[PDB]
Design a protein around this nucleic acid. Sequence first.
RNA 1: AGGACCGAACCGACUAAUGUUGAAAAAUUAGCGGAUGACUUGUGGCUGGGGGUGAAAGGCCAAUCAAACCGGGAGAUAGCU
RNA 2: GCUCGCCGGAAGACCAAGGGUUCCUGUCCAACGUUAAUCGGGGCAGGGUGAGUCGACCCCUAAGGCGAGGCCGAAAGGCGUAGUCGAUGGGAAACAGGUUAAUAUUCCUGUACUUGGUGUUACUGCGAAGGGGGGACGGAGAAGGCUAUGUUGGCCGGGCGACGGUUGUCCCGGUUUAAGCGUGUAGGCUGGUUUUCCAGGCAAAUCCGGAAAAUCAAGGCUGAGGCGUGAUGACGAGGCACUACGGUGCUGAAGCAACAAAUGCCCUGCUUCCAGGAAAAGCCUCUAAGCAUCAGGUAACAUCAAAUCGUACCCCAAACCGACACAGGUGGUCAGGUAGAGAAUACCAAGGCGCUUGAGAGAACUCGGGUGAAGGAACUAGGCAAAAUGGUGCCGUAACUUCGGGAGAAGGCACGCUGAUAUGUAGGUGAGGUCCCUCGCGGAUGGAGCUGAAAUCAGUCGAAGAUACCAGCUGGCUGCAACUGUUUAUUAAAAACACAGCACUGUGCAAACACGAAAGUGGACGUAUACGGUGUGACGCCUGCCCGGUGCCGGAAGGUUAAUU
Lengths: 93, 271, 46
Amino acid sequence: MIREERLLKVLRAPHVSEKASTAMEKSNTIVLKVAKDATKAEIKAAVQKLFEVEVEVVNTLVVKGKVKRHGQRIGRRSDWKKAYVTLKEGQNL
Amino acid sequence: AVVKCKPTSPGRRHVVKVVNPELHKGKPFAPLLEKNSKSGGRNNNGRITTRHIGGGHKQAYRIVDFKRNKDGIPAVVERLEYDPNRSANIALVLYKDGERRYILAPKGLKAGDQIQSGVDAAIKPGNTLPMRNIPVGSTVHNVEMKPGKGGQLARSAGTYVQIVARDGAYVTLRLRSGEMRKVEADCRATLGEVGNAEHMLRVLGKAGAARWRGVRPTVRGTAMNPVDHPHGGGEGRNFGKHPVTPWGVQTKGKKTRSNKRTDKFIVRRRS
Amino acid sequence: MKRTFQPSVLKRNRSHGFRARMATKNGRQVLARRRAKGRARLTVSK
RNA sequence: AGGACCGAACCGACUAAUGUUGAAAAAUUAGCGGAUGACUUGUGGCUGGGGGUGAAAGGCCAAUCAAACCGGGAGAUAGCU
RNA sequence: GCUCGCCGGAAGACCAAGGGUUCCUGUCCAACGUUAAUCGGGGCAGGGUGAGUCGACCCCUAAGGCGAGGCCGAAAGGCGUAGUCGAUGGGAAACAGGUUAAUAUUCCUGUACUUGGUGUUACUGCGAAGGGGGGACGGAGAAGGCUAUGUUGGCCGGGCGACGGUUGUCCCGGUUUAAGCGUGUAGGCUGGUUUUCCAGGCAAAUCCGGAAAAUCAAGGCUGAGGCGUGAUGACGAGGCACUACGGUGCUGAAGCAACAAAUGCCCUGCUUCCAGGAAAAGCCUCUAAGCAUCAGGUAACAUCAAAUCGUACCCCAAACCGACACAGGUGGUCAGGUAGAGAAUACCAAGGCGCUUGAGAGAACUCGGGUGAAGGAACUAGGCAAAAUGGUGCCGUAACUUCGGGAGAAGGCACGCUGAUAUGUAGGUGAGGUCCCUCGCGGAUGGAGCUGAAAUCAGUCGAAGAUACCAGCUGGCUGCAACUGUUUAUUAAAAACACAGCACUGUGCAAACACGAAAGUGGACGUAUACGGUGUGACGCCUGCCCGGUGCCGGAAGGUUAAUU
Ligand SMILES: [Mg+2]
Ligand SMILES: [Mg+2]
Ligand SMILES: [Mg+2]
Ligand SMILES: [Mg+2]
Ligand SMILES: [Mg+2]
Ligand SMILES: [Mg+2]
Ligand SMILES: [Mg+2]
Ligand SMILES: [Mg+2]
Ligand SMILES: [Mg+2]
Ligand SMILES: [Mg+2]
Ligand SMILES: [Mg+2]
Ligand SMILES: [Mg+2]
Ligand SMILES: [Mg+2]
Ligand SMILES: [Mg+2]
Ligand SMILES: [Mg+2]
Ligand SMILES: [Mg+2]
Ligand SMILES: [Mg+2]
Ligand SMILES: [Mg+2]
Ligand SMILES: [Mg+2]
Ligand SMILES: [Mg+2]
Ligand SMILES: [Mg+2]
Ligand SMILES: [Mg+2]
Ligand SMILES: [Mg+2]
Ligand SMILES: [Mg+2]
Ligand SMILES: [Mg+2]
Ligand SMILES: [Mg+2]
Ligand SMILES: [Mg+2]
Ligand SMILES: [Mg+2]
Ligand SMILES: [Mg+2]
Ligand SMILES: [Mg+2]
Ligand SMILES: [Mg+2]
Ligand SMILES: [Mg+2]
Ligand SMILES: [Mg+2]
Ligand SMILES: [Mg+2]
Ligand SMILES: [Mg+2]
Ligand SMILES: [Mg+2]
Ligand SMILES: [Mg+2]
Ligand SMILES: [Mg+2]
Ligand SMILES: [Mg+2]
Ligand SMILES: [Mg+2]
Ligand SMILES: [Mg+2]
Ligand SMILES: [Mg+2]
Ligand SMILES: [Mg+2]
Ligand SMILES: [Mg+2]
Ligand SMILES: [Mg+2]
Ligand SMILES: [Mg+2]
Ligand SMILES: [Mg+2]
Ligand SMILES: [Mg+2]
Ligand SMILES: [Mg+2]
Ligand SMILES: [Mg+2]
Ligand SMILES: [Mg+2]
Ligand SMILES: [Mg+2]
Ligand SMILES: [Mg+2]
Ligand SMILES: [Mg+2]
């Protein structure tokens, strides 16, 4: 079983966007910025424990950082992980 | 059977082909096959060490019994086959105990024939005996040079070795090249001549036919520049020098054999 | 017209990559040279 | 059946014109040869510089080849400008 | 927005490589864009890539790489065994419909499938680094059966026409449905079953191979498509109604048949040829040491698992390789209509574009084209270039020849349309009815319906009917090279190189020879009907004299002659 520290660290922030709102309203799916090393099982366990809801399935993808510019200084944002987690239509968290 | 093609195209006019109705037409005996991939004439350094090799048709290797060490058990010829690895035909043989092998097909060997190896075998074509038990003047092929090593002499289509003399532990053979050699009397040989003697009569007819066999074109030394052949150079057709190899050794009559170890076994050179 | 540079990431890594350099004494020498010069990128790897 | 025939793709490059500070450090246009074969093509691999490879032109080996490229001996030497 | 023009085997669509945010939205026009710019692949900000089934990762190997020991080598290192890596190849599993500004076989809806684990039950000899089978493989050719797809009819909905006519034999549009499951068909392959024995498969084996009898000879395996189900579902012209004129919601008919037909599928088949056509694992099976009322295995039921990485966008291109938003290059897949042999060509569909300087004028001259009186190569180094020929079917076709050719030699005639033969012929396809039974995706007759060349005769229009695009100029004498090929990437394609054939010569196998201070390797898992070197160059008739010079081969009496002593 996954420990408490791991599950306390794997969730970073709730993502906010129009697609997130559409998914939440339609399929009761919430979108989370998670740890880069977090697997679907850890995400599910952390959402079940720390959020106290019930989970069907986790969808994950990695967002690549954008190569940007700051006054003739090339710079790159980091990669982060995004999780589509489906809550089984009984909580509306 | 030797037949010439009709000249319905320039590449077919001079083609002469060797067709044998008795060769098997199906796939060969698979448990006796190996993969035998091509080298192009390159050694393990990756350098061309033998020129004019490359391409040609993919071939599979057939394990052939050159030793014939299953003495005393009769075997029956099952079928004659085509072997892309050599000029001779090979014959699949079934032993009484259920073991199958490929042998070099001697002249006249046909399906249903009976063969045997050992000291107590009859003097029939296809039968293998130690040369101590073979009468003087016989005609043999697949001749051993060491006992139990396997046949190494007279293995090409139409070739044979005559037993000239015999005294003591050695016999005197007459080789296909015309050379008289001494061989230990306990080396084994197969009675008869190697089959497919009509092999020399084939005419390839065109360049691509030789390319199918994996031989690349030869470029004359006199056609290149002196930087890459001793024959090279000149304004027009010029030679003015004694012929040599690409590496400078005379190539018209100069002898290259130097083996003092085996010189004792040669009664007389091919001359 | 076909030009000389025809990219292939696998061939690039196998010919000039970090592990190919580390495989021989002379490749290790080129790595040491580039470290002494302070190249910000030792090889083609990234 | 065929290194068979005519002819697209595909592979080439015989002629002419244009272009020649080009659209292009070798092309365009109109014609042209081969087009089931010694054919052509993708991917990967091997051969290393007095060495490789070459159906042989001293051809090709990264727009470089009668001895590649980079670094070093090195401020070579220069009765010459 | 309406007109016009261009591509349409692409200038449309989708992958792989490669690139990396170029994708979508808001905003801005300084610089970049060969002009302007409100626009942009430009700047700035925010958003966007969802997988048990697709790919990688993974299991398995090829070429090849590395390589414990090992062999070799002044050092560095080189080769290689057992091993271990290495795809461009083998190996489990998902389809339709809908949805975003941008993702979808990944989200949703519906219906599936695969491999492994955990438990329960029943039965039961399981077991591998070993054996056997399988996986497992070429070129070409031909037929038959299909489907994708298309056309037409039938049906459903709509229409009655800006100018003569248009209730009809008229016009427009639609007529779609997957994987999976069940059936096991056209067709391909092979004789089954049971005993007894055995010098083989390194041991063993009940498995494979072999020998001998009994008996029945129809059993077994593979197999496109069709049909049923999936599916009373979904989709669906069109209508109703809103819209901030993007788009949103609901309703929603018909949803059949015949014919034609692939380069796709049956087919990893069949026939045929010689140049004789990977490997290993997954898989099935056999036992061994062993375990032995335990493990293990077979089968049914339930539960659990299928992680990680990729997924936007370009991809014949303004995003890749070419310094550029560069007339260049870049592997694979899809493949509609009319004409046509055709993926040629012309005009079009779906879809996508008008190529990021324009406006005038209508000089010389340059470029790319059209036509030309009379003459017709008089041009010129040379008919360079241009002009000309050009299809199908039929008649006819010389010297010479290696008997195949030459040959499409040359040359000549017909060709459109309408009607009749014949309200659609020859042919192809094929329903209803009937008959039989191994009863079914069966067979025999039946010919409805559909589709449909070629020709003959008459008639008819034009200057012209292979009317456009497309599409051989032909003949005669002669040099060289036999021929197909190859070559100076970028001024030379040839008479040069190669070539099949010929000859000489070396080479007896630890071969000669070549790469290597060596170990080793190629030659070759070949063995003199083989392999290397050299010259010549299909074929026909032939290949004369000289061994004094130089080379090579053979000899070893005599003269000379090194280290050595
Ligand atoms: Mg899901
Ligand atoms: Mg040779
Ligand atoms: Mg030759
Ligand atoms: Mg020359
Ligand atoms: Mg020389
Ligand atoms: Mg001369
Ligand atoms: Mg002379
Ligand atoms: Mg041809
Ligand atoms: Mg042609
Ligand atoms: Mg070329
Ligand atoms: Mg051209
Ligand atoms: Mg031709
Ligand atoms: Mg020259
Ligand atoms: Mg170059
Ligand atoms: Mg030099
Ligand atoms: Mg110096
Ligand atoms: Mg100087
Ligand atoms: Mg950007
Ligand atoms: Mg855009
Ligand atoms: Mg302005
Ligand atoms: Mg501007
Ligand atoms: Mg932008
Ligand atoms: Mg994923
Ligand atoms: Mg290996
Ligand atoms: Mg090694
Ligand atoms: Mg070692
Ligand atoms: Mg492996
Ligand atoms: Mg692969
Ligand atoms: Mg998209
Ligand atoms: Mg159909
Ligand atoms: Mg084809
Ligand atoms: Mg996409
Ligand atoms: Mg432009
Ligand atoms: Mg371009
Ligand atoms: Mg190409
Ligand atoms: Mg076209
Ligand atoms: Mg003008
Ligand atoms: Mg003009
Ligand atoms: Mg004209
Ligand atoms: Mg005129
Ligand atoms: Mg006139
Ligand atoms: Mg005239
Ligand atoms: Mg004149
Ligand atoms: Mg004149
Ligand atoms: Mg001309
Ligand atoms: Mg013309
Ligand atoms: Mg007519
Ligand atoms: Mg003359
Ligand atoms: Mg020629
Ligand atoms: Mg030619
Ligand atoms: Mg040139
Ligand atoms: Mg040229
Ligand atoms: Mg050897
Ligand atoms: Mg010659």
